[PDB]
Design a protein around this ligand. Structure first.
Ligand SMILES: Nc1ncnc2c1ncn2[C@@H]1O[C@H](COP(=O)(O)OP(=O)(O)OP(=O)(O)O)[C@@H](O)[C@H]1O
Ligand SMILES: Nc1ncnc2c1ncn2[C@@H]1O[C@H](COP(=O)(O)OP(=O)(O)O)[C@@H](O)[C@H]1O
Ligand SMILES: [Mg+2]
Lengths: 453, 910
């Protein structure tokens, strides 16, 4: 992948930190060489896994655990774990050479894998490093660089996380979105004055201005080695893993990491519902109720988008533009029509086909969106979107503020069950198990290929 | 040029098409402007004539005319609506007003009437009224002129949309469902209590309102209204309401750009279409973008996904600038390094085609300002019913359902094949071929049956024909019969028996299918393995039609793959700026330009007699389509006359695109059109007629009688079946070796005509039989190992009669001028000695039995005027045997070309 580039200098700095970091006395590995080797593995995983996404985090953890335990442990361990990864991959099958009372943790791993709990089996290797994965706080504080790239997918943006960090980190995060030539000139002035003033600056969505970055930002960051001699400022970049390929030298000069934090369905509902009234009310009570239902539907559709091909054949990124268009349509239909609910039948067919079904190009996914809309919008005085919540229709006095408070209360009362992806969404649990088995198979195949290479 | 044309004022009309997009000319008066006329041909008369003094600038009077045409269109619309409101037939008002005005008046009146009809829920009466209006328009279409016919067809399209919507509303069970359906349908309204007349009429869809700008649109190609089209309109109006642009993406040929253009026409706008990936310069596009922003027109980027990366980035930046200015509401946006006003009525649409990587999406900077939508091919049944309703078909719903069911049933039951395509395109082809058949038989079910039998049946294989017949019988209750049978069948029999061809049932069937297919189709494809009879079939049909109608025929047989694209279509000297005709365009110009020759009363045929590939046919796809024009990359755009017909003679379609197969009438030869003992007879007659010019009468009659009765198919059928048992190097089926056998036999018989007059009948019969055996052996098993040749010799001596002179491995007729007997001998084994200095010359050969036999057969094949192919391992002696056979003779001179991994065709000529 174009984002996972690694250089010799970064590796050598990470190894230097092994000695530089006089951390807590680790496990007694006899000779100092073994302890240094273990610390090297720990530091490499702790630093260089941030620049990777979840799947490659798992792949790195498993592969480096295999590399370490193919030397520390015995053959009865090596062939056991080799056949174990063969079992996890769906390409091979068999029983490992389980030596009783000799490889205990391998027996816990066997208990994990037989119970078909793939996620815990893959997190076992991460747990065996006994190291806490660096959050962005650790990366921004420890790394002695002024440039970071915050990559992710198109479904989640970590701008709020960076805002929360920098508000708690010494001053004034300053968001500078790109776009038209006005945005470009504003950004260049802002950076030229911020390298002197020292405030942390952020560059949302670098990708759309790729041609600009190839010409202005590239040579700038490559030449401004005196920025470290300027005031202590940090320049951040937000990109997309599926986006266009950033230039290699620009990416190599800056630090990189991948933001992997998918909020829960209830968390997304709460965030959207909170943000909707921040801009102020537009119409009466029914507009508020329809906006609440639209927030629930948007959260459900975005959550189901994550699963692929389960729920949806493709990862149709439903951004906020779809929500805005659906909200505008809801306001229009509730304004032209009357207070009664009669036009629900046309609220669905427009939302399920025109605003949220426009991007869809397969009939099965269109059917999925249509049935989701039918479930969410068709309701008669009591709506059960997920098996844990019931939404009563508005009152008779039509007190809008009380209705908004009641909707907030009914959001806060409920909690998300651990099996929400099977209960809150309509797809079955066996589908989720098949999805997890597929991803575990991919991880095992990739790590076996790497180990063989 | 316009600036310098400020005195004549008549040179602007050339550029009116470019600067207005819809009107092609300005109709002048002696000193006034008396109107305009569009590309389709239609006089829009301005209410207020424009005076043109000599001192006035072109800019000023063009500016006044720009508003005058829109005001005239609104005046026509208002007059037509006032006329139709005071109830009057559409037939009397079609002849008065332009298509756009009558269209908008009809749409507004339909909306007004159906609103109250939906209020009262009485749809039957208005449905019947609209049906009567449609029938009146249909019968007036037959009695329409060349200009009014397009207007009537477009009004039929819109009126059938009206009737479809009214019927769907009638079938709705509940008022809620009826209003749901009414919301999606694009309704039209006008404000009776407003000023600024040009903004009176607007359009409401899904609750969103769009103003109707009264720009003249002419009489455009109206798209058939389908429930997938109105979804496209709803998506476009949803995007336009929030000021977002409009993006379509989907498979090519789904009419994305045509859907955008139809949306523009319904709103009264002409959409400026920027065509991409046509070596389209960026500066001209930037100028067009500035014009779009300043005027307020709708700009559609056709095939936007194919552009150079730098050009794509620049144009995406410009589009983002325009869209940001529209969304914010700011005026005077900054582009082209200039601040220019931005009219708020501007809009940008994009159509993205699927690339090599599969799906194509917008650049990142545009994804935040464009609402993508996925286009699909329409449902077959809906537009099938719509087209059958376009024609005067009764029970059009039932006919369309039956046709669609039959097509799906065929696709499910018939054996899979590469050219078997029963999608929507096949349906549209069936309906288009059904259209002209209405003159012969009426608009019943049997017309559809005949069109299906004339389109689908020829393209089907042998085993699937029975499926076609029985499913046609069990789906369509009535099975028709074809007319014009006796005359053309007799003419085909005459034109075939005149050329020696055998009128078997299969050959006559294929000829009849080709004749019926060419009756309507313009581009023909004939597919079948080598030797089926494609050339024989189409030549026989050409001769039959020449004898029948009396029209002359001009045939241009061109091999496409021999000639490069520059030679076939036309080459341009980019370094000197001259365009060369090429081959196809030269013979097209000789048709259009010339009139002295018999070119109006004659049928022109261009037979591409070679394998076809997508690269060659994509340069003439416009010829294949309904445009019927050859679009050269640079030069005049040639119109093909009705007589000009393109045929494709090939043997496979493993590389031809589905579009070409669907557009072109396909005739598939699943089997040989004649049996073995009909091709043999045809070749025998073709050789007898050649010998006839250099022989006496009685001798020739006796000789041909002996040749005919000497062999019979009873004995030869076993030989032909046994020849397949032999292993053949460079294998060719015996149906193609028959030519070599017959030609060699006849030539060998003719070569000894001097020694036949004084020859006894028994010895003469033995000579003829032996020579026939020799020819049969060297044609059927002539490409065998050499021991299998002896096995075939034993087979030959077995299956023929036991009394005729047996053929041995070396039996040759040697004739001496001093004796009269045939004196057949074999195995000479000559001897020769040579000096030391002659040990290596390029012409020294030691004569052995193999060398003599090979030389004799090679020379006999050469004298038969047929090409030879010597196939053997390296060093076997093919070149040596040729050069020895031709060095002895003083009639042939050898030219040795040595082919390599790539020898271009001009190497042979050089
Ligand atoms: N009706 C017929 N009766 C007898 N012989 C026939 C008949 N039709 C065709 N033949 C024989 O079959 C031959 C087929 O020639 P033709 O050029 O039509 O073949 P084709 O299948 O189109 O192949 P090609 O690819 O070589 O052009 C004719 O030359 C003739 O010898
Ligand atoms: N009967 C023969 N007398 C003399 N030379 C022969 C005879 N048969 C085969 N050869 C040799 O076989 C070789 C075949 O050469 P050539 O004709 O160039 O091969 P090809 O026909 O495969 O191109 C000749 O060089 C010749 O010397
Ligand atoms: Mg032919």
């Amino acid at each position: 992948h174009w984002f996972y580039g690694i250089s010799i200098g970064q590796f050598l700095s990470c190894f230097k930190r092994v000695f530089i970091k006089k951390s807590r006395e680790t496990r007694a590995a006899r000779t100092r060489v073994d302890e240094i080797l273990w610390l090297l593995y720990q530091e490499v995983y702790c630093q260089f896994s941030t620049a990777l996404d979840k799947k490659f985090k798992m792949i790195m953890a498993m592969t480096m655990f295999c590399l370490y335990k193919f030397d520390i442990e015995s053959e009865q361990y090596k062939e056991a774990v080799l056949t174990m990864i063969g079992v996890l991959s769906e390409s091979s099958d068999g029983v490992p050479k389980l030596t009783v009372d000799t490889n205990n943790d391998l027996r816990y791993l066997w208990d994990y894998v037989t119970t078909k709990s793939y996620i815990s089996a893959l997190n076992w290797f991460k747990n065996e490093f006994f190291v806490d994965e660096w959050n962005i706080a650790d990366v921004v504080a420890n790394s002695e660089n002024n440039y970071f790239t915050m990559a992710s997918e198109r479904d989640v943006d970590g701008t709020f996380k960076l805002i929360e960090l920098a508000k708690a980190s010494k001053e004034s995060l300053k968001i500078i979105p790109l776009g038209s030539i006005e945005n470009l000139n504003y950004a260049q002035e802002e950076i030229s004055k911020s390298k002197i003033e020292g405030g942390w600056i952020l560059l949302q969505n670098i990708q759309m201005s790729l041609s600009w970055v190839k010409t202005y930002l590239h040579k700038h960051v490559e030449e401004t080695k005196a920025a470290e001699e300027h005031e202590k400022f940090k320049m951040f970049m937000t990109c997309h893993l599926t986006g266009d390929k950033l230039p290699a030298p620009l990416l190599q000069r800056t630090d990189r990491f991948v933001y992997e934090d998918i909020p829960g369905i209830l968390d997304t509902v709460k965030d959207l519902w909170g943000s909707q009234f921040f801009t102020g009310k537009i119409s009466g009570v029914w507009s508020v109720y329809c906006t609440f239902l639209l927030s629930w539907f948007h959260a459900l559709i975005t959550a189901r988008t994550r699963l692929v091909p389960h729920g949806f054949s493709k990862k149709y990124y439903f951004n906020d533009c779809d929500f805005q268009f659906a909200s505008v349509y809801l306001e229009n239909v509730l304004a032209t029509n009357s207070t009664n609910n009669i036009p629900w039948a046309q609220v669905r067919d427009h939302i399920a086909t025109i605003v949220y079904g426009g991007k869809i190009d397969e009939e099965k996914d269109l059917e999925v969106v249509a049935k989701l809309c039918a479930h969410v919008f068709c309701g008669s005085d009591n709506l059960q979107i997920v098996p844990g919540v019931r939404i009563p229709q508005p009152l008779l006095q039509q007190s809008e503020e009380e209705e908004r408070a009641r909707l907030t209360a009914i959001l806060s009362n409920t909690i998300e069950p651990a099996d929400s992806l099977s209960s809150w969404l309509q797809l079955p649990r066996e589908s989720i198990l098949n999805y997890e088995r597929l991803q575990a198979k991919e991880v095992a195949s990739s790590t076996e290929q790497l180990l063989q290479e | 040029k316009i600036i310098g044309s400020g005195k004549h004022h008549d040179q602007v009309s050339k550029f009116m098409k470019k600067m207005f997009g819809s009107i092609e000319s300005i109709i002048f008066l002696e000193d006034f402007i008396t109107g305009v006329r569009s590309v389709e041909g239609e006089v829009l008369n301005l209410n207020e004539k424009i005076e043109l003094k000599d001192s006035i600038q072109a800019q000023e009077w063009l500016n006044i005319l720009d508003t005058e045409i829109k005001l005239s269109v609104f005046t026509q619309f208002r007059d037509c609506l006032g006329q139709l409101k005071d109830g009057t037939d559409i037939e009397v008002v079609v002849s008065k007003y332009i298509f756009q005005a009558i269209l908008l008046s009809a749409q507004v009146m339909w909306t007004e009437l159906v609103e109250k009809c939906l209020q009262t829920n009485q749809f039957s009466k208005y449905w019947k009224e609209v049906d009567m209006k449609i029938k009146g328009l249909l019968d007036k279409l037959n009695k329409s002129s060349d200009n009014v016919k397009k207007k009537i067809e477009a009004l039929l399209v819109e009126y059938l949309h009206f009737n479809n919507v009214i019927g769907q509303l009638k079938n709705c069970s509940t008022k809620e469902e009826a209003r749901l359906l009414w919301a999606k349908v694009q309704k039209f309204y006008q404000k009776n209590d407003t000023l600024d007349d040009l903004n009176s009429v607007f359009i409401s869809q899904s609750g969103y309102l769009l103003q109707y700008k009264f720009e003249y649109i002419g009489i455009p190609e109206r798209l058939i209204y389908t429930p997938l089209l109105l979804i496209g309109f709803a998506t476009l109006t949803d995007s336009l309401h929030q000021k977002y642009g409009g993006c379509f993406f989907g498979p090519a040929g789904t009419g994305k750009t045509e859907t955008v253009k139809a949306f523009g026409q319904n709103l009264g706008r002409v959409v400026v279409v920027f065509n991409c990936d046509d070596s389209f310069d960026y500066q001209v596009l930037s100028r067009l973008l500035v014009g779009i922003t300043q005027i307020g027109a709708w700009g559609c980027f056709d095939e936007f996904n194919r552009l150079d990366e730098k050009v794509l980035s620049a144009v995406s930046a410009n589009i983002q600038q325009i869209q940001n200015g529209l969304q914010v509401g700011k005026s005077h946006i900054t582009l082209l390094e200039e601040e220019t006003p931005l009219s708020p009525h501007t809009a940008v649409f994009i159509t993205l085609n699927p690339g090599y990587n599969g799906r194509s999406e917008l650049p990142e900077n545009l994804k935040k300002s464009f609402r993508e939508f996925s286009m699909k091919s329409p449902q077959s049944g809906t537009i099938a019913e719509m087209i059958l309703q376009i024609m005067g078909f009764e029970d059009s719903k039932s006919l369309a359902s039956k046709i669609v069911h039959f097509l799906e049933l065929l696709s499910s039951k018939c054996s899979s094949m590469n050219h078997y395509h029963f999608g929507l395109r096949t349906l549209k082809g069936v309906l288009r071929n059904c259209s002209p058949l209405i003159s012969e038989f009426g608009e019943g079910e049997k017309t559809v049956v005949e069109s299906l039998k004339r389109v689908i049946l020829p393209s089907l294989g042998d085993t699937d024909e029975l499926v076609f017949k029985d499913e046609l019988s069990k789906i369509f209750d009535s099975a028709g019969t074809p007319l014009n049978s006796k005359a053309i069948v007799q003419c085909l029999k005459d034109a075939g028996q005149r050329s020696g061809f055998s009128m078997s049932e299969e050959f006559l069937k294929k000829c009849m299918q080709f004749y019926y297919m060419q009756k309507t189709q313009q581009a023909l494809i004939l597919v079948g393995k080598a030797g089926c009879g494609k050339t024989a079939t189409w030549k026989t049909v050409i001769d039959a039609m020449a004898i029948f109608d009396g029209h002359a025929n001009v045939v241009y047989v061109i091999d496409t793959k021999v000639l490069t694209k520059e030679s076939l279509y036309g080459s341009m000297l980019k370094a000197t700026l001259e365009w060369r005709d090429g081959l196809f365009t030269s013979i097209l110009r000789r048709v259009n330009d010339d009139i002295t020759g018999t070119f109006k009363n004659s049928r022109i045929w261009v037979v591409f007699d070679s394998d076809l590939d997508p690269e060659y046919v994509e340069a003439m796809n416009s010829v294949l389509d309904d445009n019927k024009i050859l679009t050269l990359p640079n030069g005049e755009r040639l119109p093909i006359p009705p007589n000009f017909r393109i045929l494709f003679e090939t043997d496979n379609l493993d590389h031809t695109t589905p579009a070409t197969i669907t557009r072109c009438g396909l005739l598939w030869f699943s089997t040989d059109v004649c049996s073995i003992s009909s091709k043999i007879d045809h070749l025998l007659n073709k050789s007898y007629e050649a010998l006839d010019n250099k022989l006496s009468m009685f001798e020739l009659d006796k000789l041909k009688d002996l040749i005919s009765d000497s062999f019979d198919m009873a004995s030869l059928t076993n030989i032909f079946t046994c020849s397949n048992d032999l292993v053949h190097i460079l294998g060719v089926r015996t149906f193609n070796k028959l030519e070599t056998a017959v030609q060699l036999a006849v030539h060998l018989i003719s070569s000894y005509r001097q020694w036949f007059q004084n020859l006894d009948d028994k010895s003469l019969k033995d000579v003829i039989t032996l020579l026939i055996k020799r020819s049969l052996l060297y044609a059927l098993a002539g490409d065998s190992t050499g021991e299998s040749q002896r096995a075939f010799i034993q087979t030959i001596n077995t299956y023929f009669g036991h009394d005729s002179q047996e053929l041995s491995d070396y039996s040759t007729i040697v004739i001496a001028n001093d004796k009269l007997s045939f004196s057949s001998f074999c195995s000479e084994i000559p001897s020769v000695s040579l000096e030391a200095h002659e040990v290596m010359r390029p012409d020294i050969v030691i004569p052995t039995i193999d060398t003599i036999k090979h030389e004799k057969i090679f020379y006999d094949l050469l004298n038969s005027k047929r090409g030879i192919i010597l196939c053997g391992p390296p060093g076997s002696g093919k070149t040596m045997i040729m050069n020895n056979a031709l060095r002895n003779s003083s009639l042939y001179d050898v030219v040795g070309i040595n082919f390599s991994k790539d020898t271009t065709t001009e190497h042979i000529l050089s």
